[PDB]
Design an enzyme around this catalytic site. Structure first.
Site, PDB file in Angstrom:
ATOM      1  N   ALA A  88      69.236  30.878 -44.762  1.00 52.89           N
ATOM      2  CA  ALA A  88      68.515  29.627 -44.570  1.00 52.89           C
ATOM      3  C   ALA A  88      69.478  28.760 -43.730  1.00 52.89           C
ATOM      4  CB  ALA A  88      68.229  28.973 -45.921  1.00 52.89           C
ATOM      5  N   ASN A 115      69.648  26.817 -49.742  1.00 55.18           N
ATOM      6  CA  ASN A 115      69.203  27.991 -50.519  1.00 55.18           C
ATOM      7  C   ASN A 115      67.845  28.427 -49.963  1.00 55.18           C
ATOM      8  OD1 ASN A 115      67.987  29.608 -52.764  1.00 55.18           O
ATOM      9  ND2 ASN A 115      69.786  28.854 -53.884  1.00 55.18           N
ATOM     10  N   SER A 125      72.113  37.408 -59.161  1.00 52.13           N
ATOM     11  CA  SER A 125      71.192  38.341 -58.504  1.00 52.13           C
ATOM     12  C   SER A 125      71.898  39.017 -57.315  1.00 52.13           C
ATOM     13  CB  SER A 125      69.939  37.596 -58.017  1.00 52.13           C
ATOM     14  OG  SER A 125      70.281  36.620 -57.052  1.00 52.13           O
ATOM     15  N   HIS A 132      80.054  34.343 -54.785  1.00 55.47           N
ATOM     16  CA  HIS A 132      79.478  33.096 -54.299  1.00 55.47           C
ATOM     17  C   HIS A 132      79.149  32.134 -55.407  1.00 55.47           C
ATOM     18  CE1 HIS A 132      75.809  34.976 -55.721  1.00 55.47           C
ATOM     19  NE2 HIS A 132      75.236  33.788 -55.664  1.00 55.47           N
TER      20      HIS A 132
END
Ligand SMILES: Nc1ncnc2c1ncn2[C@@H]1O[C@H](COP(=O)(O)O)[C@@H](O)[C@H]1O
Ligand SMILES: Nc1ncnc2c1ncn2[C@@H]1O[C@H](COP(=O)(O)O)[C@@H](O)[C@H]1O
Ligand SMILES: [Zn+2]
Ligand SMILES: [Zn+2]
Ligand SMILES: [Zn+2]
Ligand SMILES: [Zn+2]
Lengths: 311, 305
Positions: free
Chosen positions: B37, B57, B136, B141
């Site tokens: 993004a 995000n 996920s 990060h």
């Protein structure tokens, strides 16, 4: 459409930001709880039928209690006093509660009551939490069917948070938030003395609140008719969840009144039963903020649960 | 042994204490940006050869377009993903303290930008690594979530500490060494076991001085923290067998009035994703902790790396 919502019964912001049709679960033959093996269980409080060899349920003490009932006279820091007990739901090993008739569930619910009263006799105990954990990741350590109750020497957050909230809503509006349930929450199903809803600002997706239609501040005011009725609705709610969500781990929590509530708290203190199917976990935002992110609006959950067919 | 309840002003809630035994390429890969993004900035600034980037995000929990608008409020907020290393093969803590400094300072740069929006009440920054702790993606990060209101945890923290301050006239976090179990400290912090920690092996890193604001983070302290954060995360993996985690920076809302500054203090909370939750905690909001902070401190004070 992401928004934030708040229910004066939970008193904390939840974010609603997602399809409701695709949400599904992702989470021995005998045991000491089985009939004829009571010698393998911690001490018993009582068993229905009252003192009977062919029992339906039993209310026994937890063999590995989280709180010590032997610290009563001893009460920043307080002693671990409490009553962490177990209510045995069926003499049979493998039958799940949702497969128990509604009259049998009523009786289990009647047991909670009787015990709460037995406990309410202890001035030290200020709030008992009747909760059920079915499933490994939902915390079920035993496969046999059971539920847990714990009596506490303090009033917890969600409660003082619920009491702090429904009062602020009552003072102004003049009404008890739960009395407004059918107009403020999304209706799923209704029984003679209870109604189920997806909460306006639900914490968890597919979460449910079976709410007394009459205004009742304390759970322990359960009678036999109401106990069988609610049982049928709780039985109905657990079956629609199991079918629609693929038998997800789920636990239920009965929310009630502080043991020493005030005569003033009564008009807005209203108990209920919360069902939370496990469909996902949390991360650093939730643990860190106390704010939850719900991926499904109760607008949809209420549509789904209404469309569930049980035949 | 004998269970016990304990409270703290920071949390303003009791926990049930009930007792060294515990244990256990991608789009973010340097060379795939246009596949992320939009970018807010990177470090080195405007350097095609980056060490970290702060981007929006892709799947925000709160829409950054709903800004104009606003028991209910519009879903306005910002949600960003701090990409901590252009190398898919690195652990946040396997990283160099100076580089952890870079990331921290980046949080500070993104908070000031955000603080320019009168519509933002709080700015929580968190780290997720490991599936069970929520993660996920495997590439190292963290994340930042900017909110239009002050959330539940901050609410209570403001109340608990304020009330504590009306008591002894003292900021409890400035009293960390007389209320918490010290494991380790650097020229500016004291990672600590909290007197009444909610989760087993929970660790709090506490700025020694009174910085009611994370964003008051400077370079030397920024790298001063990196070394301690790194030391705790490495000791954590070592003794507990590399458990996923979610650390959370606790700090103050953008509308902190002056009357709240003496007792508002910022700290980082490390939660090795361990203990599980069921109906008791769900219905009560009171957690049970199987290991006292006295035992956790001693265990972690002896970890060898
Ligand atoms: N033999 C036993 N007699 C009484 N309680 C037990 C026994 N074995 C295990 N328990 C408890 O029963 C509970 C069932 O948990 P489940 O619901 O998540 C646990 O809290 C255990 O401590
Ligand atoms: N291509 C992408 N660009 C920006 N953010 C992403 C992208 N892919 C995944 N994310 C986000 O990165 C985070 C990685 O998840 P992890 O942490 O559990 C999630 O919050 C995602 O919304
Ligand atoms: Zn069994
Ligand atoms: Zn009511
Ligand atoms: Zn990568
Ligand atoms: Zn301080």
């Amino acid at each position: 459409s992401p928004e934030l919502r708040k229910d004066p019964v939970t008193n904390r912001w939840v974010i609603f930001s997602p399809r409701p049709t695709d949400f599904k679960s992702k989470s021995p033959s005998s045991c000491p709880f089985c009939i004829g093996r009571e010698q393998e269980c911690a001490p018993e409080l009582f068993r229905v039928p009252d003192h009977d060899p062919n029992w339906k349920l039993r209310v026994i003490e937890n063999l590995y209690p989280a709180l010590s009932r032997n610290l009563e006279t001893q009460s920043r820091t307080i002693v671990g006093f409490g009553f962490h007990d177990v209510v045995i739901e069926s003499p049979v090993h493998s039958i799940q509660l949702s497969d128990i008739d509604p009259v049998g569930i009523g009786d289990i619910l009647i047991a909670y009551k009787k015990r709460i009263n037995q406990i309410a006799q202890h001035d030290s105990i200020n709030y008992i939490q009747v909760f059920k954990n079915q499933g490994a990741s939902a915390g079920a350590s035993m496969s046999h069917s059971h539920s847990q109750m714990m009596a506490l020497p303090v009033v917890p957050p969600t409660v003082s948070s619920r009491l702090d909230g429904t009062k602020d809503y009552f003072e102004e509006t003049g009404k008890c938030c739960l009395c407004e349930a059918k107009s403020k929450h999304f209706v799923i199903d209704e029984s003679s003395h209870f109604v189920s809803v997806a909460p306006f600002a639900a914490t968890y997706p597919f979460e449910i609140w079976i709410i007394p239609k009459d205004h009742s501040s304390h759970f322990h005011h359960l009678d036999d008719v109401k106990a069988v009725d609610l049982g049928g609705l709780l039985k109905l709610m657990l079956q629609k969840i199991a079918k629609q969500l693929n038998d997800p781990p789920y636990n239920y929590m009965i929310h009630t009144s502080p043991l020493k509530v005030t005569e003033s708290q009564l008009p807005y203190t209203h108990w209920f039963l919360q069902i939370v199917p496990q469909l996902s976990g949390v991360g650093g935002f939730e643990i860190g903020t106390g704010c939850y992110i719900n991926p499904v609006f109760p607008e949809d959950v209420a549509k789904v649960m209404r469309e569930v067919s049980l035949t």
